[PDB]
Amino acid sequence: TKPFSLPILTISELTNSRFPAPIDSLYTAQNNNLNVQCQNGRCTLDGELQGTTQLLPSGICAFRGKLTADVHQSHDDRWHMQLTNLNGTPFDPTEDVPAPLGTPDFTGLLFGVASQRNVVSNPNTTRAHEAVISTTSSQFVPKLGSINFGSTSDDFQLQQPTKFTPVGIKVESGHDFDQWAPPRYSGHLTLNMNLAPPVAPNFPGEQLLFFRSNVPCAGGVSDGVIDCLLPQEWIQHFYQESAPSQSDVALIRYVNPDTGRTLFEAKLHRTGYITVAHSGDYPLVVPSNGYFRFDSWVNQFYSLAPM
Amino acid sequence: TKPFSLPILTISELTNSRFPAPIDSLYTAQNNNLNVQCQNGRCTLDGELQGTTQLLPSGICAFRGKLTADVHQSHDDRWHMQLTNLNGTPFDPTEDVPAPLGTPDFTGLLFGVASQRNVVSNPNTTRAHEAVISTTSSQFVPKLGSINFGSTSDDFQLQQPTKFTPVGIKVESGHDFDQWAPPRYSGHLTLNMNLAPPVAPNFPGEQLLFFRSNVPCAGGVSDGVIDCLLPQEWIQHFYQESAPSQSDVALIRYVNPDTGRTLFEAKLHRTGYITVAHSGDYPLVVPSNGYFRFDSWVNQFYSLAPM
Numbered sequence A, B: 001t002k003p004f005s006l007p008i009l010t011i012s013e014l015t016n017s018r019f020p021a022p023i024d025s026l027y028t029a030q031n032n033n034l035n036v037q038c039q040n041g042r043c044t045l046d047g048e049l050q051g052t053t054q055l056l057p058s059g060i061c062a063f064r065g066k067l068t069a070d071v072h073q074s075h076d077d078r079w080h081m082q083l084t085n086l087n088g089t090p091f092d093p094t095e096d097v098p099a100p101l102g103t104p105d106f107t108g109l110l111f112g113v114a115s116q117r118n119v120v121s122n123p124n125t126t127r128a129h130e131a132v133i134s135t136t137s138s139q140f141v142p143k144l145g146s147i148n149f150g151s152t153s154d155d156f157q158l159q160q161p162t163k164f165t166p167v168g169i170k171v172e173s174g175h176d177f178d179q180w181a182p183p184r185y186s187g188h189l190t191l192n193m194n195l196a197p198p199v200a201p202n203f204p205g206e207q208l209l210f211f212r213s214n215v216p217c218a219g220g221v222s223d224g225v226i227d228c229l230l231p232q233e234w235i236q237h238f239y240q241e242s243a244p245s246q247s248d249v250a251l252i253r254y255v256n257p258d259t260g261r262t263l264f265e266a267k268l269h270r271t272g273y274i275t276v277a278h279s280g281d282y283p284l285v286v287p288s289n290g291y292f293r294f295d296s297w298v299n300q301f302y303s304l305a306p307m
Helices: A232-241 B232-241
Strands: A025-028 A063-070 A079-083 A109-117 A126-134 A146-149 A161-170 A206-214 A225-228 A249-255 A262-269 A273-277 A291-298 B025-028 B063-070 B079-083 B109-117 B126-134 B146-149 B161-170 B206-214 B225-228 B249-255 B262-269 B273-277 B291-298
Touching: A063 A146, A109 B109, A109 B161, A126 A146, A126 A161, A126 B126, A161 B109, A161 B161, A232 B232, A262 A291, B063 B146, B126 B146, B126 B161, B262 B291
Parallel strands: none
Antiparallel strands: A025 A206, A063 A079, A063 A161, A079 A146, A109 A126, A109 A161, A206 A225, A206 A273, A249 A262, A249 A291, A262 A273, B025 B206, B063 B079, B063 B161, B079 B146, B109 B126, B109 B161, B206 B225, B206 B273, B249 B262, B249 B291, B262 B273
């Protein structure tokens, strides 16, 4: 009986589930048989988080732990960060997850700030400085329990609680940003495990619909595009509600509450993604006040009205 | 009829409503007749946001707009940032709010990153660098439509879309951090307006209960303490549910779901804060898996069990 629903939230009240940023727009992409397999922002309609997904917006692309080595002699990313879980519990590499929850799920340079606060030696002395994590580095091995970051500052200490706060991406020669290629969580030559599955439209005339953000970039030419399948707020709502999925597809309608009219319809799939009936790359023209509403559960024969 | 409720979330699944950070602990403070009047993280139990409160964790202590001047000759905080609303709409200083929503509500130095992405001239060229905003500066006038930040980098452009992403605080001589003193949103010699009201316990033997975070600090001795009255997730839940407040106080119980037992009880007040029966400063001893549950609406005679 318990009815499925979506939270009532406009575009400007939504957060990207793959990076801590407001959603800027909705976007549908032409089918180019690309492997869409992000690991953050993955959740079933009945509230089961998948991949590296966790509930905190503050946790997305963040790390926690401490520095155990300064390896400038052998690597440019000199600071070796031994990880814990974001809540501070010890990281268990035997957990059936691809990596610690919150780990970034794209290929490129993650720009942010690394900060420390000492606990015994010199209690409450602090520092923080810009830092860059390459998700493509040989030392990006979060599934093994560690990542490295580089920094222009020298002012970091070993064996002190450390946090990485993400801010944006960075583009430079030899480090192209690819939002659709997950990193190798256990390093080079090792395959990823426990991945949330690829998603694809498998109905004639349909395309994925994404919630798009343009995130900050610390130099380089980039539009900063990071597309997620579901807003973080939807994920948080599904986790709370745990409403049973009565079929594999929920029909949702985008509504303008002021005029009361439905602007278009879409399929929200049980495994946590959306398709629309459209052909071509297209940034959606929709009102500021509009939002999706659950309409009904539908079967495998249902065809969408063209959007 | 519609029942009031709280979201089911453990401490480590909660976000501070006054700074983008996980909640670290629960804390009750001795009554010292301090004016507790934060402006972020303010919401009634039936879902009415107050003060500068808005729904996005990404919006808390963030700014958006563009730089219109470089005033290094007259001020150390050289970069003059003309503000918009966080969603990009123009800031209306006649709105009945104390400042643009998301504006910080404490006295001290806010450390983060300022970033830019060009839109016409040199489309999609980008930069980002550490920046510091003094909420006590003569140029901190967010209610008038602008704030200034300082930066060690010189690499900023005028008339380009700019964002400030908060990361932490900074402590230095002559800039002590006071989480309980709101800034002067319209500058020196002007009083604040449209403030969410002060909160205080006004029942014998009661104290406020806070959700405490220790946020990053970019140098200085600081515990980084920022206490909020309600988690952001609770605020987001109340906004969605809009459950009527049947009296001025909801009795809530902190429960350990695994053992099934209630650990202590507290009063959750209609205007969005919590009291407990306790005497003294005290960091609460509670299980990792525990969370508050709504019990019942109570009247003005109800006395809490000692916590």
